[PDB]
Amino acid sequence: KALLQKSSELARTAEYEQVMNFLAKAISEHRSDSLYITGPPGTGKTAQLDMIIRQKFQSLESVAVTSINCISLGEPSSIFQKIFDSFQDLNGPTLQIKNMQHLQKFLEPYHKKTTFVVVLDEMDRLLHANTSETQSVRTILELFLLAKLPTVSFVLIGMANSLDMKDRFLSRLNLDRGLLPQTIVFQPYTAEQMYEIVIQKMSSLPTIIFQPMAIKFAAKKCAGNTGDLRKLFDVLRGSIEIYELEKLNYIAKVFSKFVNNNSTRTRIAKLNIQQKLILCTIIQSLKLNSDATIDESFDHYIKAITKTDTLAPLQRNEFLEICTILETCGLVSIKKTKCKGKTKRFVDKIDVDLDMREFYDEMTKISILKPFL
Amino acid sequence: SRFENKLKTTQKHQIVETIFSKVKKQLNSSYYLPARENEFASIYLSAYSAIESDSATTIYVAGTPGVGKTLTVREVVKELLSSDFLYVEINGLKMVKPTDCYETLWNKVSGERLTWAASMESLEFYFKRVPKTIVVLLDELDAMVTKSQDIMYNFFNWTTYENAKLIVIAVANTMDLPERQLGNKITSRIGFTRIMFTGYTHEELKNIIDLRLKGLNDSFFYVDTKTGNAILVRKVRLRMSADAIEIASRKVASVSGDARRALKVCKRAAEIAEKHYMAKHGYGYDGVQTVHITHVMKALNETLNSHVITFMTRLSFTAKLFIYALLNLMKKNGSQEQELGDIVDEIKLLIEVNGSNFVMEIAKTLFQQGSDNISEQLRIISWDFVLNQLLDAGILFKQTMKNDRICCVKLNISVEEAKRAMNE
Amino acid sequence: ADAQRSHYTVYPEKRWELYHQLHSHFH
Amino acid sequence: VFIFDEIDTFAGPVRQTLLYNLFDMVEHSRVPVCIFGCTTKLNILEYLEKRVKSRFSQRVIYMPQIQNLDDMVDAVRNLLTVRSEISPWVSQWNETLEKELSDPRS
Amino acid sequence: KSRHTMSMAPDVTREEFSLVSNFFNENFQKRPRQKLFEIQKKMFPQYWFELTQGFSLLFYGVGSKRNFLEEFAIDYLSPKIAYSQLVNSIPCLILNGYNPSCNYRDVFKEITDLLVPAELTRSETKGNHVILQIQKMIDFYKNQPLDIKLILVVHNLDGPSIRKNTFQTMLSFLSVIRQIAIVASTDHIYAPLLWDNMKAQNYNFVFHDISNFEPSTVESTFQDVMKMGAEGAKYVLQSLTVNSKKMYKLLIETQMQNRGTQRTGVELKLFNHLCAADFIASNEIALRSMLREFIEHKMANITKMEIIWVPYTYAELEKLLKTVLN
Ligand SMILES: Nc1ncnc2c1ncn2[C@@H]1O[C@H](COP(=O)(O)OP(=O)(O)OP(O)(O)=S)[C@@H](O)[C@H]1O
Numbered sequence A: 001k002a003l004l005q006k007s008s009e010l011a012r013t014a015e016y017e018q019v020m021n022f023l024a025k026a027i028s029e030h031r032s033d034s035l036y037i038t039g040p041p042g043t044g045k046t047a048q049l050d051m052i053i054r055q056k057f058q059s060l061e062s063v064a065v066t067s068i069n070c071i072s073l074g075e076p077s078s079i080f081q082k083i084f085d086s087f088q089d090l091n092g093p094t095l096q097i098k099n100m101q102h103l104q105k106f107l108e109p110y111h112k113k114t115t116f117v118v119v120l121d122e123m124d125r126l127l128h129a130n131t132s133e134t135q136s137v138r139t140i141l142e143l144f145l146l147a148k149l150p151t152v153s154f155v156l157i158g159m160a161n162s163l164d165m166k167d168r169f170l171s172r173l174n175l176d177r178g179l180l181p182q183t184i185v186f187q188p189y190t191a192e193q194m195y196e197i198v199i200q201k202m203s204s205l206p207t208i209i210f211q212p213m214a215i216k217f218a219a220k221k222c223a224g225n226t227g228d229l230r231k232l233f234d235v236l237r238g239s240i241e242i243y244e245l246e247k248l249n250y251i252a253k254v255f256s257k258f259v260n261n262n263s264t265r266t267r268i269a270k271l272n273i274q275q276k277l278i279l280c281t282i283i284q285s286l287k288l289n290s291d292a293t294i295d296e297s298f299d300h301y302i303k304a305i306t307k308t309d310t311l312a313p314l315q316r317n318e319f320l321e322i323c324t325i326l327e328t329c330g331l332v333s334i335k336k337t338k339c340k341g342k343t344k345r346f347v348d349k350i351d352v353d354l355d356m357r358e359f360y361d362e363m364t365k366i367s368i369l370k371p372f373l
Numbered sequence B: 001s002r003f004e005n006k007l008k009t010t011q012k013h014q015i016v017e018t019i020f021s022k023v024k025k026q027l028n029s030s031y032y033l034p035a036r037e038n039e040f041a042s043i044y045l046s047a048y049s050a051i052e053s054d055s056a057t058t059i060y061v062a063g064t065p066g067v068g069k070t071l072t073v074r075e076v077v078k079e080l081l082s083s084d085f086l087y088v089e090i091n092g093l094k095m096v097k098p099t100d101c102y103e104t105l106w107n108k109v110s111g112e113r114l115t116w117a118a119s120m121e122s123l124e125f126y127f128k129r130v131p132k133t134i135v136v137l138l139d140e141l142d143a144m145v146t147k148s149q150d151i152m153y154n155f156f157n158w159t160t161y162e163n164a165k166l167i168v169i170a171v172a173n174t175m176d177l178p179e180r181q182l183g184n185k186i187t188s189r190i191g192f193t194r195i196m197f198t199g200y201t202h203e204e205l206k207n208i209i210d211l212r213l214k215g216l217n218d219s220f221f222y223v224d225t226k227t228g229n230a231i232l233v234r235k236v237r238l239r240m241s242a243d244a245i246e247i248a249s250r251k252v253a254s255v256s257g258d259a260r261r262a263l264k265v266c267k268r269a270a271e272i273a274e275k276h277y278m279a280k281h282g283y284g285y286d287g288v289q290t291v292h293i294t295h296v297m298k299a300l301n302e303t304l305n306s307h308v309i310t311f312m313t314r315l316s317f318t319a320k321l322f323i324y325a326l327l328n329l330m331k332k333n334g335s336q337e338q339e340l341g342d343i344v345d346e347i348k349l350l351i352e353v354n355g356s357n358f359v360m361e362i363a364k365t366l367f368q369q370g371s372d373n374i375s376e377q378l379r380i381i382s383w384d385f386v387l388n389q390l391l392d393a394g395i396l397f398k399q400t401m402k403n404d405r406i407c408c409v410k411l412n413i414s415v416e417e418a419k420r421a422m423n424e
Numbered sequence C: 001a002d003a004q005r006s007h008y009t010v011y012p013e014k015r016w017e018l019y020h021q022l023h024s025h026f027h
Numbered sequence D: 001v002f003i004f005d006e007i008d009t010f011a012g013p014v015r016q017t018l019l020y021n022l023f024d025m026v027e028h029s030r031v032p033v034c035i036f037g038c039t040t041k042l043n044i045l046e047y048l049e050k051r052v053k054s055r056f057s058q059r060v061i062y063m064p065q066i067q068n069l070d071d072m073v074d075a076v077r078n079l080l081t082v083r084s085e086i087s088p089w090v091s092q093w094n095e096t097l098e099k100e101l102s103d104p105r106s
Numbered sequence E: 001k002s003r004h005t006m007s008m009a010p011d012v013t014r015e016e017f018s019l020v021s022n023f024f025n026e027n028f029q030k031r032p033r034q035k036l037f038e039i040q041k042k043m044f045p046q047y048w049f050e051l052t053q054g055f056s057l058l059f060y061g062v063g064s065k066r067n068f069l070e071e072f073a074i075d076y077l078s079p080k081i082a083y084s085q086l087v088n089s090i091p092c093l094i095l096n097g098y099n100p101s102c103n104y105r106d107v108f109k110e111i112t113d114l115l116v117p118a119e120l121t122r123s124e125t126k127g128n129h130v131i132l133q134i135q136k137m138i139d140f141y142k143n144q145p146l147d148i149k150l151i152l153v154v155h156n157l158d159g160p161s162i163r164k165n166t167f168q169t170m171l172s173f174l175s176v177i178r179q180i181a182i183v184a185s186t187d188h189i190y191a192p193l194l195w196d197n198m199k200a201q202n203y204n205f206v207f208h209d210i211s212n213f214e215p216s217t218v219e220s221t222f223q224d225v226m227k228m229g230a231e232g233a234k235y236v237l238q239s240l241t242v243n244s245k246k247m248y249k250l251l252i253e254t255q256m257q258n259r260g261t262q263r264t265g266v267e268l269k270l271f272n273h274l275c276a277a278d279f280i281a282s283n284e285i286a287l288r289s290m291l292r293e294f295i296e297h298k299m300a301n302i303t304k305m306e307i308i309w310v311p312y313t314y315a316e317l318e319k320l321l322k323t324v325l326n
């Protein structure tokens, strides 16, 4: 029963039909349309263009069109080095890849005059690099300039996450210049183009690959906040091993991990009634909305416990251990914040994820914290 | 590898293996698991599929330290050697600079020492070109996230290549880590597996202790009465009271649920009975024994109880004179942070507001060490010294200023216990 | 077109003679 | 044997790498080690973070102080008194020391 | 303090602004503009004659002078001087001062390569040797035959990088050399604050007015105002999930039910119940996670009831209602 679901985990898209119109001159060897391909994240958009060019290169005339990933540069030189790697040649590399005018000499081909288009992968690392109008916008500016006179032009295909980048362009560039205009976006496929690809990615079909309306149910009730349904099939591939482990069932398993302690399991964290007392003690110190030290909390803990004698006053060292019991369940977090007297000195400020509405319910059942409120 | 041959020496003069020595040998933190039994499969069945199908996935586990996530994934790969992969422990905190892990990967594919720059070029050249198997553990991921997230994007972008022979296993501190430090673009690549590890429970904390106490609980030793040496003249036995082991469990599962903390509090409580046994008979270093409940009562408290209260009452007089002046200003002004000159202003005033009493033998000594020749000191004797002594002790805290009057002073421990320890 | 790139170089009297005998002589 | 002076400065906020490696050498190494942190920052244990303190065997020992006036008086007697015979002056010198020390008005 | 504000203005999008701006700057006062340009054309022989005296020529005046300098330097002067000395004509090195990315090292590295490398001047390249290397250039040039070999142009001399003081003194030592003619323009009203009698001694500036009331097309690009957030988050909503549009629509209604300030906002509990009422929000976490996406792109605010409020104006939210949400 394994080998049917061993193969489970692994032209084709209805977005490739768009881009061949957008590359309408790429089979007639002319300069194509003006390509700035954006997208909200997770939407397949990195592999989307990679699907096109791999279908382009396997289809396509002299054949040399290269694509490089802009991740580890922070600087516009070695991209123009990596276009030279499809030549397998040798030259003086440093000057030719550095200046704007130095790129222009690089664009005279050798063997058969096939035009070249570059593909700039993950442009947002250089967009969201160092300060905008100094280097990175200038880097954006310099690449999109295609004023070259022969039709051999370095057509850009760049990609980005957040859609602020168009308004970042200068008003000269927004005057119908370069690869600007066609701001081709990709709205996140709800279930209406992505699930059908999963259907065709179920070409080798096992018998029980589950009631597919539940798969449709999975698609409809994941599409609130999602972009990657194969990865959201990779959460089906984990639950398909649950039915192997036991020889949207799992989204139900995963949300109760996150929703609880405020409604119900707050009292699970405080089986000690003193842990209930010390939890209200933190919030009474939160009146002075300050750097809530473990000492200022201990200050209000003593000066209240001398008034109402519910228990004896305990140690600060005990007060250290008891607040860590509050910590490991995930209620209150402790951080070493800032005080700048001698050096960067670290006093510990706490923060609570509970509200007084979710407090007042669980304390009226216990009239021993009622003196303390 | 090499130098372990040189770490061996010859003369080992018959070390006394006492009663409690053989406990601590197995109470060492080294040597199937009861608590995370089924979740071992949830890793492994997630891992067994990708391994025998030549894919590239991601597995994300979280949890507080002391829950076995350092341990369990080592047990995953260990049995897999019986049944194609290269195991690497890419620890985050064991990298000096964060880019230094890049050097390890390119070292651990062919054996070359190249740039973190030049490594990741050939790494990227590996991960999209090789025709068709690498297991990598990205431990303690708080270290490698800090600078600008450009490292962390790489370690999951390599997973996206369908021609990438790699299997990554991330182990973090918190589940929140790709939601409060990383971007959403990484959070798409992290997936939504998210195998949560909770704490241990106190029943299972009993079930983890006896795994170390398998062949030695209530067993028998062969002992000579002259040297205290035990052998697995009397034939004595040693028993472990399980209720004291239980009360060790019901605290550590309550506060932390940490597997090191449970073993070590048993390990600390074991040696308390060791010295008391050596106290009564003195076998040195060259009818039925047990470990009481009263041992783990002390040693668990020994994790808690302080001494700054006992430190303060065992300090100097002018130290206790200093703090008593300091709380007097904090109840005079209610500003919790007083100027240094006002304290020197106060300790002058706190002399003569008391009567002409012992205070005079103090007030003689407080401004001159006897020696009526040299006198008329402005600030008190060793005032720089006690203020330096209260500074490096951590009780006080004083901001830096070249003015020795208006530099502010802030307390660092709770001022009530300062008030409370002053009463003695 | 190129003006946003900084510092790009490019490679594109009967009366006055009586001034010329006077100017340099002064200088 | 490790001898660490001012281990608190290693316990900074940012990295804490070197502490994390030696404390894990307690857990796994066949080579028997022992670590000796010496410091003066009193609450050293809160200065550590979580993942290092769980490696730590939690046993600290506080250093004593002269708790009574009589203690250092007993100390200075053991400090100045010579017990080995070197000089003819020694037996005369030893009783001069305590006679100053025995008198509370000296 | 009832003040009319730029937020309370009928705003204009990107393509609408720049096109009708391009209509004015090429058709408003076209006839008198070239009518000025023909009048000042007769001054061009006068500039040629004075520039033989090594005079640093400086152009002030209202309006942009960028077009005028490039006509005067490139087409008119630079071949006229090459013909009058007797072959490629005189090299023109412009300096775009409105471009803030001008440094002192890079432009001078061009200069010593533009000027003659007759000696090993890279030996004196050593650590600031720039004033050192130009001093060895100056005294050699005192004993050369007097002829211009280079004319440089510095547009917008009060620019964001050229007005820096270590760059200004660098140009001062260039101007004392007789072989190079220095034709620059500034636009600031406090431009003669830049020079003392030390530098003007090295400069010997003369002045001329040119006021053509040009629109400064290139010089407007780097500059920005609030035309160049209410407009920022106007584009993110156009690419999201369809549910975020609806949960912002229910957000924007009761936040405009009551400028858009804090007081019109809503509590988190009821808004959870309101977005539970239309079968949208499952609970607090599923609400907040796709509300952090509105938080991450700074599209909504929260202050303290637990009030979440939109920081856009009263007029803006109904514009966000009828256009992008509907
Ligand atoms: N419509 C689709 N057709 C084919 N494969 C798809 C499709 N949608 C998603 N995938 C696959 O699932 C993956 C999920 O996309 P991600 O790579 O996580 O996001 P992305 O491709 O990086 O785009 P971003 O996040 O904007 S950079 C893609 O890379 C593809 O491998």
Ligand SMILES: Nc1ncnc2c1ncn2[C@@H]1O[C@H](COP(=O)(O)OP(=O)(O)OP(O)(O)=S)[C@@H](O)[C@H]1O
Pocket: B029, B030, B033, B034, B035, B036, B064, B065, B066, B067, B068, B069, B070, B071, B072, B208, B211, B259, B260, D051, D054
């Ligand atoms: N279920 C178990 N069975 C046996 N021994 C265990 C078990 N859980 C933990 N231990 C032991 O306790 C040690 C605790 O280390 P781990 O919990 O694996 O590390 P951890 O949980 O990752 O904490 P870190 O590494 O600081 S994040 C292990 O190295 C084992 O020696």
